């Protein structure tokens, strides 16, 4: 079956990967001026794991 | 004794089961892969024994016979663990060998070698019919009725002398409905020729194999073997015993088939080379610059010796009508003119090939022969080259110089595909589904083309309409040509073609003997093309003026023509017109390829008419 | 193709071409040879080959002689008027071996 | 389509290993990003971040694996290996499946899966020789396989229970076992009037 | 009779449907039948010729009872049978262009009817219409294969030389190696300019 | 009525209904002749024609007498029943229908009949377990198996094609990233 | 003991069940009683389905096919035990009472993987019950087996007895009871064999070979040592094609016994024959319905059908009517006449077609090899004199000269297509005379002074001496063949391949409309693995044709043969084609179905041979 869409959890995680990959662009800023980049690496990282998950989702149905 | 063994079949079950390269585990994997397929083997690659404990491979190589049946009892251990649960059968397992040890040749075979594992090459000129050895002999008493039974491993045992509890000096009886059976297989292998010393004739072995390698093989193969050099006691000198090779593992050299009823014994690898090969736009100007790449010019014997390697397409009406699917060619010419070259060539890039010379050849030699054997003292059957290269070509050199009554029996077996017999109270008619090449010169040697072109030729028309395309090659003296021969030849000679010749394999202009041979192969087994509705429509406007052509110039010439044109001919067209459409793996032939058969047609069989 | 009176089937002998392989084969009056016998040479002269397929033995012997043939012209003398193809009963396939 | 055909109605053996990278795994950590009372910090959206920036070297925590993967990428990281990658427990579960022809062992649904991602990744951290971690966990692969083969004889129009059955082993077999039940299912429905 | 010229349409459309699965990549699907499908539409319309000649001889008095009965109803089924081989070859060939379009213009045309051509193009503006809008923050046209892999090394297959692309730059010298984020160089990977992973 | 299961465009169901099966005649019907290959002629009762399914399987139902009668068709004959009961596993279906199950689940449709159901449903059970020796065994082809495979319909050739795809992918998965 | 009563009872309940086989015991009983002792006799066998078998208990059934040995001798000794409730007469023989003639079971259908044939059958498939299909070659002759020998005890009045046992007898092992009679009593009483009393049972083996259309690319067939005992000894002759069921068994010490040294050397096989089921279709004739005979009844009625019939001999191949009705002539073969004083006249038409290369003369050779009940092939170089004729050979069970057929015998009652036949040896075509004028060929060889039967019809085909027909010359210069051998044959058609525009173009059209065909079920490009009738029905139609009908020569007829005869011989005619137009006449009213020769069968019969002489 086609089964009824998330329409409120899709809402928020799509205000999220938008704030998310605003706030890496933001703290990227930080580093031209610890310094460690683990936490960058990560949160890259993270959004794409994410938005691998919505795309699969979003194609298949 | 027992301890030993039981310590030595620990070891390779220990083997199986540890042995791993990378994540997999690759006997444990092989064995349960096996299993399901229901094949009761193992394949075991000698380097894997030697890396994992080299004293295994010192036990196993210093006494074959003994230490062989340790390994299959540990395999079968291995097979009951890894595929049935415990506590809730399968036969005893054959080892297959791999190695890289060096070959030996086999005239080099002597008292050295008695009992070691020996690697070697060969072609394969005969196979036995499969005899049954037994497994397990289920036993009973003659005289108290008592009764047991004997496993047995086919290594180097016999009906016990005392009842094992008077009863008697020879008291046992095999009984057959509890007793078990494996097939066995004769080969007999002769060296390769290469290999031959100078005037010697050609050696020979007669070896043995059992289970899963038995029917693995055909006569005129190649093939190397692993195996136990060993003797055995024929009633056939004094302490003189015969040798012989127990084949603990075949590998045919270039994946020649062997009994194949045409399954897809293919790997994806190399399917989808060839399915990209295919669809090449330029694939008919490579395979025909492959064909013989040290032989120059001859460009319309190399596109039609193309056409003979695909065949056409073989059809059975409702009718129970057999058509013809093989194209057979004459190559008739003036001498030194790569003739010979070529027919020596088609022999190596055939999947199967015999090369023959008419005049080394007899009817029964080519076709079916009637041998007396001298245990029965029966006669049975034995196949000829025509057999031999069944489903194949047949190159048939001094087609000229062959005997009247030996060239007769060939006209069957070119047209009808059969050899039919009826002699010494056998009769048959066997299959022989095969192309024949042949190599002629005409009469008086060179064609002198001043003279009759009827006068030329000593073959008569029930002969050369068997033929579809017939080349009438003649050699012309022009000063440009052959400067452009002389410095090609030349370039042979001093070495320089040879890296031209691989040079243009790396750049694609050419394919290699084994990578040709493995594609004809494949396009025989994927496609038989059938005639597009418009293909026909000029396939018949062209026959009836190829006929009025000809009838044109018998009235110039006041006779009928010595090279015909018959239907046989139309069908010729036809044929040559599907081969085209093999190379290329269309399912359908096309007005594309009705222009260049009739172009083959026009540049062989006709303008050899048109003389 | 000899065939045995014992196990009475059938096994090649060698000829001359093979007793010679790797060496010389010598065929004096080579223009009084029958045609039929004349013309067994021409597979061991370029192909270095003998090639039987007799009595269901069919195989390829290695011949690897040069041959040396010696020759008189029609009519026992040579006449130096004509061409050779001429002076001489053989053809072209064997003359251009 | 949108959805390309290997897809359709099942998982990938990489998007299996995908979810299976969404589980927590206890680790080692190398570096000490905690700060003393006496910086970039990690700020993720799908897993608890109060993990990560409480960090002290030597001291064991739980992350989410895809992240114990990425930190043991660098010297960054050691990973635990879980209390059932032992040859104890392993040789306990070989026994309970030998014993229950009828059942498969209660191993975790990610097993094939965790050993093969740990087995290449961490293959220093075990405590036991990796040989025979490796040996056991085919061992299990291999006893599993023929009570999956035993099960196959039941397929049926109504159903099937598969109690312990990982998911990689269920990944497998799903375009098998669903395809001949939906054509049982296609006969029988057929029959009926 | 009538079906028999369908069932060749749809033995093309399964022959084409292992082709485009057997082979690996995305192959160019194979050229349209216009023919076969122009003999299909005239078989159509002589069933059409054949409804109104029958529907005609009704008031003419030709026992319409049992003979228009069976002969309008046997006409039409064979109509409804060219109907269906007909789109079941037209849907399977929507089927691979709606392929293409994600798989490859997401990121041969002599084969295709002009039909198809308009459609091929309609379609490809479709996806970008989704892709372009909410929802743009997920490149829809990307991978299905799952980002399992953070940095890869790349070896740059073809040159093309000092190109641009949406994170950075890259001089594709050919045989040069690069160790760099998956996200960036995966379009690169698709177009086959780069090697590995 | 049809069932949802099989597809308006669904090719291999498309090519099954191509199928001719064997059908008596109950009427006679002028014009109707190009079923006999001659359009000028009337149909015949009693004239034992073959007809594709999807012109047989509507004229079954309609006319109660209807239009046509199917005969038993080669493919269910009691010989086809018995070589099916006694090895399910050797036996060559290929030659018996290309499409042999998709034709006996809408001939089990047509006429309702627990037999044929009974017997159709164990052959299916039955090579099932062999499409998975030979789908999960992976070389590192087997003439034992291209011997099966050729053995083999069109409908459980996707069965083998998608099993032995999913085998494959899970042996690449585990032995190399 | 144990588990063989059992299965003795549960093949008891089996019988009880499928009352058939109560009914066919009966049916043999009763008629065995009317022909021996009320007034030739049936055998005491009953051939069991096999699906009965399955349906009643499979693991009897599988018992039966996979271990034979355990499961068919308690269920023919089930099958004796229900044989003798059934059995009574008043006062029966003693050979009866001694008899030693148990019920034997034969099997029906469905063999599944155990159908195999002599390439395929391998030692995994040892001590099973296996169908096995191929052509017989090398039947050995009869031999009695004892396998009983009852004596008489002087000074006592007892008559004893003992039985024998032989590997082949049984389907179990025993010890083999030596061959040797007892000459003494227990007691120490001289005694004396009673044959007549005792028990012998015919034997035979058989070899079956692979059919050479099976046998795999350039292999030479496999072949099976069958044995045969009871009924089922003549059931085959060499060249029958068959499908025999029986256990395949092995034999002999294979070389375990100190006697011998090769330790290379296996075991012997053979299959113990339990059932054989001959064969011709590539089934050893049509059995027809009530609605086969009343389709060949009706359709002979329409006056068109020797156009019907023979234009569906032979579709593939264009042109060529006339040829094609006299092959229709050969096959409804006129009628032999066994005169009194050795004057015994031919029924057999003989046809040599004789023409240019590649004109279908081969590709009609191999229709009538295809299309007829039996049909011999042969060609010109591949036959010997010896192979055409009977060969000597030693029969290796027995250590006996005999005689094996050669084509011309194996054909006798059918066709023997010769192709190449002016390829033949002088030496050879000696065989060929014999055939065609006496139907029989003489042996005088090896101390065999025999006549065999050969009543054949000779079809062949040759070339002219010039490869082409030279229409500036003679017939006796263009065909290289005898004339006191032309004269055997009674139609030699003369064929050329000549150039005509339009008939160029017509027979090119047909050969690429034949190039074209697909056969169903196949795919484009997939590789092979107003009136005419299907050519199973024109095998019917010849075979109603030959069992039904035997037409009478009429005065009508006569009136035109003699007409026709007077004729052509008054403008190579001769005394031999008077008796040419009877045979094409009296063919012809078996076309029609028709018990006399009537005036129209005498005229298609001059016309058909008018042609053949003028080329009209
Ligand atoms: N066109 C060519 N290109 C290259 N080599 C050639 C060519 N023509 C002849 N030769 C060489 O010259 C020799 C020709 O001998 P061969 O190929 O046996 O001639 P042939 O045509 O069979 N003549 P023959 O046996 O006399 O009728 C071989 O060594 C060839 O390689
Ligand atoms: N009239 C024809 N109609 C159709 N095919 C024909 C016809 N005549 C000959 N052919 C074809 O020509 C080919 C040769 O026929 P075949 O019977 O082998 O020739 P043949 O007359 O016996 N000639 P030959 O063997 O040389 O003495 C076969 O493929 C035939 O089908
Ligand atoms: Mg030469
Ligand atoms: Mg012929
Ligand atoms: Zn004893």
């Known amino acids: 079956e086609l089964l009824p869409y998330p329409h409120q959890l899709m809402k928020r995680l799509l205000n999220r990967i938008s704030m998310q990959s605003q706030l890496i662009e933001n703290i990227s800023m930080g580093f031209l001026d610890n310094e460690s980049k683990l936490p960058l690496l990560c949160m890259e990282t993270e959004l794409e794991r994410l938005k691998f998950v919505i795309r699969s989702y979003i194609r298949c149905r | 004794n027992d301890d030993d063994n039981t310590e030595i079949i620990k070891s390779f079950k220990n083997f199986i089961l540890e042995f791993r390269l990378d994540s997999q585990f690759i006997y444990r994997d092989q064995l349960r892969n096996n299993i399901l397929v229901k094949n009761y083997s193992l394949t075991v690659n000698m380097e894997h024994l030697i890396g994992y404990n080299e004293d295994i491979y010192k036990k196993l190589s210093d006494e074959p016979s003994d230490i062989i049946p340790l390994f299959e009892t540990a395999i079968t251990q291995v097979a009951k663990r890894i595929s049935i649960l415990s506590r809730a059968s399968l036969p005893t397992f054959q080892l297959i060998l791999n190695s890289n040890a060096n070959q030996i040749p086999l005239r080099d075979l002597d008292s050295e070698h008695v009992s070691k594992i020996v690697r070697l090459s060969g072609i394969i000129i005969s196979t036995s019919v499969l005899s049954s050895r037994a497994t397990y002999l289920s036993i009973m008493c003659r005289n108290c009725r008592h009764t047991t039974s004997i496993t047995i491993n086919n290594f180097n045992v016999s009906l016990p002398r005392s009842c094992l509890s008077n009863c008697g000096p020879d008291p046992y009886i095999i009984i057959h409905e509890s007793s078990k059976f494996i097939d066995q297989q004769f080969l007999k292998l002769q060296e390769i020729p290469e290999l031959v010393p100078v005037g010697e004739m050609p050696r020979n072995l007669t070896m043995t194999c059992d289970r899963y390698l038995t029917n693995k093989v055909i006569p005129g193969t190649r093939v190397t073997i692993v195996g136990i050099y060993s003797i055995y006691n024929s009633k056939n000198g004094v302490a003189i015993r015969t040798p012989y090779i127990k084949i603990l593992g075949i590998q045919s050299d270039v994946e020649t088939s062997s009994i194949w009823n045409s399954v897809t014994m293919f790997t994806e690898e190399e399917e989808e080379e060839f399915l990209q090969l295919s669809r090449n736009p330029k694939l008919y100007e490579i395979l025909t610059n492959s064909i013989a790449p040290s032989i120059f010019g001859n460009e319309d014997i190399k596109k039609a010796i193309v056409c003979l390697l695909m065949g056409g397409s073989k059809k059975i009406l409702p009718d129970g009508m057999r058509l013809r699917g093989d194209i057979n060619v004459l190559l008739l010419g003036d001498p030194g003119t790569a003739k010979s070259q070529l027919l020596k060539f088609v022999e190596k890039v055939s999947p199967i090939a015999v090369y023959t010379s008419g005049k080394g050849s007899s009817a029964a030699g080519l076709t079916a022969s009637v041998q007396r054997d001298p245990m029965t003292r029966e006669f049975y059957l034995e196949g000829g080259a025509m057999v031999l290269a069944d489903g194949g070509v047949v190159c048939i050199d001094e087609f000229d110089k062959m005997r009247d009554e030996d060239r007769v029996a060939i006209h069957e077996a070119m047209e009808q595909q059969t050899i039919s017999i009826a002699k010494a109270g056998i009769t048959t008619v066997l299959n022989s589904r095969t192309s024949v090449l042949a190599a002629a010169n005409p009469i008086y040697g060179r064609y002198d083309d001043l003279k009759s072109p009827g006068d030329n030729i000593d073959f008569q028309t029930t002969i050369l309409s068997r033929f579809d395309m017939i080349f009438i090659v003649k050699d012309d003296h022009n000063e440009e040509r052959d400067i452009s021969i002389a410095n090609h030849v030349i370039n042979i000679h001093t070495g320089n073609a040879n890296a031209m010749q691989n040079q243009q394999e790396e750049n694609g202009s050419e394919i290699s003997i084994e990578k040709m041979k493995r594609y004809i192969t494949y396009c025989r087994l994927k496609c038989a093309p059938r005639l597009s509705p418009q293909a026909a429509e000029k396939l018949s406007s062209n026959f009836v003026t190829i006929r009025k052509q000809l009838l044109i110039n018998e009235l110039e010439s006041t006779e009928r023509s010595s090279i015909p044109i018959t239907i046989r001919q139309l069908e010729a067209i036809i044929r040559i017109t599907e081969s085209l459409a093999k190379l290329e793996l269309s399912p359908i032939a096309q007005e594309r390829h009705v222009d260049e058969a009739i172009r083959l047609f026009q540049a062989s069989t006709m303008d050899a008419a048109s003389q | 193709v000899r065939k045995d009176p014992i196990t009475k089937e059938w096994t090649l002998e060698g000829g001359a071409l093979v007793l010679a392989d790797k060496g010389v084969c010598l065929i004096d009056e080579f223009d009084k040879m029958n045609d039929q016998d004349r013309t067994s040479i021409h597979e061991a002269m370029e192909q270095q080959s003998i090639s039987i397929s007799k009595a269901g033995i069919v195989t390829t012997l290695q011949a690897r002689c040069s041959i040396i043939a010696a020759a008189n012209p029609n009519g026992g003398r040579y006449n130096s008027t004509l061409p050779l193809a001429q002076n001489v009963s053989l053809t072209e396939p064997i003359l251009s071996r | ?193 | 009779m009538y079906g028999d010229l369908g069932n060749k349409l749809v033995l093309e459309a399964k022959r084409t449907k292992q082709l485009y699965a057997r082979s690996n990549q995305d192959v160019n699907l194979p050229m349209y039948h216009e023919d076969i499908i122009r003999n299909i539409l005239k078989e159509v319309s002589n069933l059409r010729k054949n409804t109104e000649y029958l529907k005609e001889q009704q008031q003419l008095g030709m026992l319409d009872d049992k003979v228009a009965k069976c002969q309008y109803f046997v006409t039409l089924l064979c109509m409804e049978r060219n109907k269906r081989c007909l789109l079941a070859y037209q849907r399977l060939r929507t089927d691979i262009l709606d392929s293409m379009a994600w798989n490859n213009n997401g990121l041969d045309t002599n084969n295709l009817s002009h039909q198809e051509q308009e459609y091929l193009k309609e379609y490809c503006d479709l996806i970008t219409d989704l892709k372009s809008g909410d929802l743009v923050d997920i490149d829809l046209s990307g991978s299905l294969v799952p980002p399992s892999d953070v940095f890869i090394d790349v070896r740059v297959l073809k040159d093309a030389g000092e190109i641009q692309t949406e994170y950075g730059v890259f001089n594709l010298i050919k045989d040069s190696q690069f160790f760099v984020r998956q996200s960036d160089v995966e379009r690169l990977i698709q177009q086959g300019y780069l090697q590995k992973i | 009525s049809h069932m949802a299961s099989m597809g308006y465009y669904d090719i291999d169901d498309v090519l099954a209904d191509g199928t001719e099966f064997p059908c008596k005649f109950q009427y006679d019907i002028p014009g109707l002749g190009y079923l006999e290959n001659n359009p000028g002629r009337p149909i015949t009762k009693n004239t034992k024609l073959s007809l594709p399914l999807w012109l047989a399987r509507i004229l079954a139902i309609v006319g109660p007498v209807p239009f046509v009668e199917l005969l038993p068709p080669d493919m269910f004959s009691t010989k086809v029943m018995n070589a099916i009961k006694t090895d399910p596993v050797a036996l060559d279906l290929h030659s018996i229908n290309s499409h042999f199950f998709s034709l006996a689940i809408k001939w089990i449709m047509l006429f309702s009949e627990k037999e044929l159901a009974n017997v159709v449903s164990e052959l299916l059970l039955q090579r099932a377990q062999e499409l998975n020796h030979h789908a999960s065994s992976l070389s590192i082809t087997n003439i034992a198996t291209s011997t099966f495979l050729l053995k083999l319909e069109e409908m459980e050739k996707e069965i083998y094609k998608k099993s032995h795809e999913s085998y494959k992918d899970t042996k690449r998965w585990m032995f190399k990233k | 003991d144990a588990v063989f009563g059992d299965r003795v009872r549960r093949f008891q309940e089996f019988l009880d069940t499928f009352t058939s086989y109560r009914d066919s015991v009966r049916s043999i009983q009763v008629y065995n009683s009317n022909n021996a002792a009320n007034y030739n006799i049936l055998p005491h066998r009953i051939i069991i389905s096999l699906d009965d078998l399955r349906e009643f208990d499979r693991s009897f059934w599988s018992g039966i096919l996979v271990e034979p040995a355990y499961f068919i001798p308690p269920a023919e000794k089930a099958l004796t035990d229900l044989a003798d409730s059934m059995d009574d007469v008043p006062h029966p023989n003693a050979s009866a009472v001694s008899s030693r003639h148990p019920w034997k079971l034969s099997f029906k259908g469905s063999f599944g993987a155990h159908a195999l044939s002599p390439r395929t059958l391998t030692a995994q498939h040892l001590n099973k019950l296996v169908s096995v299909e191929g052509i017989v070659t090398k039947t050995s002759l009869v031999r009695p087996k004892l396998i009983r020998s009852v004596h008489y005890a002087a000074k006592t009045g007892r008559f004893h007895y003992r039985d024998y046992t032989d590997a082949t007898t049984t389907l179990t092992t025993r010890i083999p009871t030596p061959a040797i009679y007892p000459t003494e009593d227990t007691e120490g009483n001289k005694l004396t064999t009673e044959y007549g009393y005792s028990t012998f049972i015919d034997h035979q083996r058989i070899t079956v070979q692979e059919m050479p259309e099976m046998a795999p690319a350039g292999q030479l067939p496999r072949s099976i040592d069958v044995i045969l005992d009871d009924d089922l000894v003549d059931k085959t002759k060499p060249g029958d094609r068959v499908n025999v069921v029986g256990v395949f068994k092995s034999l002999g010490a294979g070389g375990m016994n100190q006697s011998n040294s090769n330790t290379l050397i296996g075991f012997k096989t053979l299959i113990l024959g339990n059932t054989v089921y001959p064969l011709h279709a590539r089934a050893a004739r049509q059995m027809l319905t009530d609605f086969d005979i009343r389709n060949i009844n009706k359709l002979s009625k329409k006056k068109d059908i020797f156009d019907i019939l023979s234009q569906s001999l032979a579709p593939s191949i264009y042109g060529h009517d006339h040829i094609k009705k006299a092959i229709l002539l050969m096959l409804m073969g006129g009628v032999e006449k066994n005169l009194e004083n050795g004057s015994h006249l031919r029924g057999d038409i003989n046809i040599l077609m004789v023409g240019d290369p590649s004109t279908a003369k081969s590709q009609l050779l191999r229709f009538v090899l295809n299309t007829a009940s039996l049909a011999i092939a042969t060609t010109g170089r591949g036959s010997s004199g010896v192979g055409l004729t009977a060969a000597v050979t030693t029969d290796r069970e027995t250590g006996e000269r005999r005689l094996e057929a050669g084509a011309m015998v194996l054909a006798d009652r059918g066709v023997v297509c010769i192709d190449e036949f002016d390829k033949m040896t002088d030496v050879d075509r000696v065989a060929i005379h014999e055939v065609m004028e006496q139907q029989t060929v003489t042996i005088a060889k090896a101390g065999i002074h025999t006549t065999l039967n050969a009543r054949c019809s000779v079809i062949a085909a040759a070339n002219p001496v010039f490869g082409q027909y030279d229409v500036n010359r003679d017939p006796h210069q263009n065909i290289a063949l005898p004339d006191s051998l032309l004269s055997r044959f009674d139609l030699l058609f003369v064929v050329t391949d000549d150039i005509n525009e339009i008939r160029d173009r017509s027979i090119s059209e047909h050969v690429l409309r034949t190039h074209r065909y697909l056969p169903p079920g196949y795919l484009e490009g997939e590789p092979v693995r107003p009136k005419l009738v299907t050519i199973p029905f024109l095998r019917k139609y010849v075979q109603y044709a030959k069992e039904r009908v035997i037409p009478q020569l009429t005065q009508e007829a006569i009136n035109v043969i003699v007409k026709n005869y007077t004729d052509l011989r008054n403008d190579p005619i001769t005394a031999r084609t008077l008796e040419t137009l009877i045979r094409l006449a009296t063919a012809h009213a078996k076309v029609r179905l028709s018990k006399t020769v009537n005036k129209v069968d005498a005229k298609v019969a001059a016309n058909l041979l008018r042609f053949a002489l003028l080329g009209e």
């Open chain 4, 1 to 193: 389509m949108s959805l390309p055909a290997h897809l359709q109605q099942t998982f990938s053996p990489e998007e299996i290993q995908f979810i299976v990278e969404n589980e927590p795994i206890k680790i080692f950590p190398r570096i000490t990003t905690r700060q003393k009372i006496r910086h970039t910090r990690w700020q993720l959206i799908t897993t608890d971040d109060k993990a990560l920036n409480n960090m002290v070297a030597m001291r064991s925590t739980e992350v989410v694996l895809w992240i114990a993967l990425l930190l043991k990428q660098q010297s960054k990281c050691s990973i635990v290996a879980p209390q059932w990658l032992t040859t104890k427990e392993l040789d306990r579960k070989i026994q309970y499946e030998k014993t229950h022809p009828d059942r498969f062992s209660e191993l975790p649904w990610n097993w094939l899966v965790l050993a093969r991602i740990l087995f290449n990744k961490a293959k220093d951290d075990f405590h036991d020789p990796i040989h025979e971690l490796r040996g056991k966990i085919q061992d299990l692969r291999e006893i599993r396989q023929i009570k999956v083969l035993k099960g196959l004889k039941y397929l049926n129009e109504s159903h099937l229970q598969l109690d312990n059955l990982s998911l990689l082993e269920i990944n497998e077999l799903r375009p098998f076992i669903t395809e001949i039940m939906d054509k049982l299912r296609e006969i029988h429905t057929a029959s009926l009037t």
